[model samples]
Target: SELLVNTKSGKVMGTRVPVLSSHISAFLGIPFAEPPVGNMRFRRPEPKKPWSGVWNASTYPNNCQQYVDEQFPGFSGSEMWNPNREMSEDCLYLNIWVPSPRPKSTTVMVWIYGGGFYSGSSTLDVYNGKYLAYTEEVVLVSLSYRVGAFGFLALHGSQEAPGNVGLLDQRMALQWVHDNIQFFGGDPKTVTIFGESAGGASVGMHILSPGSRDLFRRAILQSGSPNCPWASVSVAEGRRRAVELGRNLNCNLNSDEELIHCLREKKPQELIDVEWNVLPFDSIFRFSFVPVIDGEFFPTSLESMLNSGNFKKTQILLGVNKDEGSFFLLYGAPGFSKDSESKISREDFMSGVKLSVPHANDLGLDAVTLQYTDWMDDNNGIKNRDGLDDIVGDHNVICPLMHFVNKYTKFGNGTYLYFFNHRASNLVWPEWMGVIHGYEIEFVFGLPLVKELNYTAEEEALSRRIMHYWATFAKTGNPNEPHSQESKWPLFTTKEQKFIDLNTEPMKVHQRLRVQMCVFWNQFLPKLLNATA
Candidate 1:
């Protein structure tokens, strides 16, 4: 029968990776949703129909249409991440790795891949679930969603193109897992969904969404949260992009129906080729066609969700790298990294601040300038650049995450946070850069277990420990339950604010992650904005 597994959509065949003791079986490229193409373009995914014949799901699927960028920063770093695969709009698929011979209601873990909301594929090597599934004995799965303009276009109240179709695609994937994972030896009761960057923010968005909140019991957000401002645009902003795209496409903006219908007629690349160009530094603030606050999906603003304690209450484990900015800043301001002598010039810094936080008044801007300034080293340009990095990190990733943690603790349920500070010894990027955005993902996915790449003994141990924590959390909603570990990853509360610092050798539990900077962004600056208003 060659490993024929019958899914609701169809019966499919899977293969076993050689590393396993024939213990793990992989089912790849199973379509969860009918392709969002033709008249269905810009609409929520339709669940796949049951095929008459057994489907061959042995190969990885096409990445949703996106222009993949190689983020090497050109320092002889590995060209490892680009999803060098075929691209298409017919790309709503899932890959599952399950234990062989059925392990009696085994835990299930789902993955959402990150590519800044515009790019990513579930089939990337770093996302391979075989090793993690084999080691942890959980049913590991990853699903693909629409990205870039194709996935995120919105026209206010237009039901056909109802904003966050990408997220809705994720919701469809989650529903598919909940409905069918049991057939693959996974317990629907023990499912934990996790992801990084935009994908992580997608996990957080699912928590905030009423349509998706009850689907999964736990989640892990690697480098993002729904609170991250850049993660979502307003429906009005999305409508503006749709209208602008229509004009670029030579279609009259007579009605939402006309615009969406016109958009459906074009080639996939043609729709994405036109840029929704923002002014100079505004690109750093938000991407062109990201998720939006549609009445159904979001129903309210991020602040409203936080204030009202309105989200799924799940046992959560979330974290960030020590320098999330290093990767972002390196690309955003290449000169700063390409030459050490160069700095983020004072004028450029001010321009950035003014553009990013346009809400800041003259006095408010002055206050921000003084607050971020390294007062003792006022004249140092390198120090100024570091200050800019801190601001970018705070404003974009860290502060928003802390804001979510603060409220999630006060009004919601149990939360465990981590600060990943370890840099890999094999990095081609500078040591000063520290751990970049997605570095921790390799260790999280158990890349160290693959010996051909040659991770050191300590790195392997670190990877094992990290996997233990993650898989244990996925199983019991408690990370410390594993064989008497070195550290206690304490619950993040309104008072304690504890978090684990993951690195080599032993994990250390620390408290108050960037307390002051987060205070400035989350608490202090809002008052200033209100005062000016």
Candidate 2:
């Protein structure tokens, strides 16, 4: 049976879909903010006006316009992860799935999709919420925010095109949920925000944002942190990129007003059609558009904020996959094509490390290479390539995550950390991928039910455990609270540095996960930071 619910903007008719034996009410394509088009382009999102009649929320909405193919060329499977049902500028919509017989005080989980801050949409099938909503008995919501130039273009000090409209879009969505989630039988006060990669970084940024305080009570960051090198850009560099964009478009470059006006007049596709140079694997942080220190949304660096303890006191669950950088290698490896038959040479590996950390001295690079070298060379070069993959993964995601967790826990915050080491057998990659970035998402969202993938019994069991853990965290700020008989997930402390190792057969807690690597990288990072400073 279909149902009608009253939102702040208007009434939405949602469809009831059977899930397992039960059913969940799914309300799709409900606009939370006015479309950022015409005069509103490049500006902060405005609230949507009240609609006249019942809005049909049965169909999915348009995703923000983006050049997905250009962003990840070698990867054809991106469409599976980031499906854009349609594309348009008028894409500020969200979807919700509420379990039938909704409880008076149900927990809510809001998902923010990640695409390196360049591309992603909530319309992706993997983001479907029926399974989790029905099984966990919790409300699930997903929202779409602007990406690429429309969302992150910065113009010095001009309010006309200030950076991080993407984050602002997220904030607006959270505010909408705070005001209206109760209508869907969710407790607004118990909302948990979670995401992977750039979305995870967005969750971290929201925790540091004064405007986003009181909006969410907890956050789960899977393989992302504001401290990650590619997470943010400096205002000066952002301004330069804006100017470059204007020159590329043959727009007026004299003043910020003219530049923004010219850009606004251009069609969305025209703005994104230009080909930009891709840097080498080591220079992966050189994303054209990313969140910046806009002084308003992001006033200071994440390190300074974490150092000064200037962030929300919300419970946090954060971790990285075992090999976060393996996917990036598909783009960085020279001989590599889409077919995955590339072999990286020792020379290529050395150059990658050097380009990745320009600040590291020869001695430091040599030490790192020595530590990561594969002594057992049987002629295939597979072992050495795997080592290179680990080095890149640690440098980009794992090390920064370790530093963030240590600092956050040092402030006595309720931080729970985990190391996701499990790779599902049904993934569309080779065994060498080694639990690559964004792999855990399918498990987190229960993708097997919707997608045509066969999960082993063990994988299915692990997915249920993960769903329970995540939903329980949303319900009580503790993953072990709701299921009292489940294995105890330990809170991270600076003392033991304990974290959960999530796998198929049995999930267990480990002390100082990747301690040796963290220790080595910890001593080496400050040197690089000092040199860069």
Local distance difference test, candidate 2:
0.80
**lDDT of each residue in 313-420, candidate 1, tens digit only:** 878999888878766666665345643544667776776556556556787778778888877877677776677667777877888999888888776668899998
lDDT of 2 by residue, 56-160 (tens): 998888889887654554554555655557789999999998988766568999999988888888988777788888889988999889888899888868888
**lDDT agreement of model 1 with the native:** 0.81
Evaluate all candidate structures by whole-model CA lDDT and list the values in order: 0.81, 0.80
Off by over 4 Å in 1: 20-23, 70-79, 276-281, 338-343, 351-364, 482-485
For residue 398, give model 2's deviation from the true position in Å.
1.2
**Positional deviation of 120 in candidate 2, in angstroms?**
0.5
TM-score of 2: 0.93
RMSD of 2: 2.7
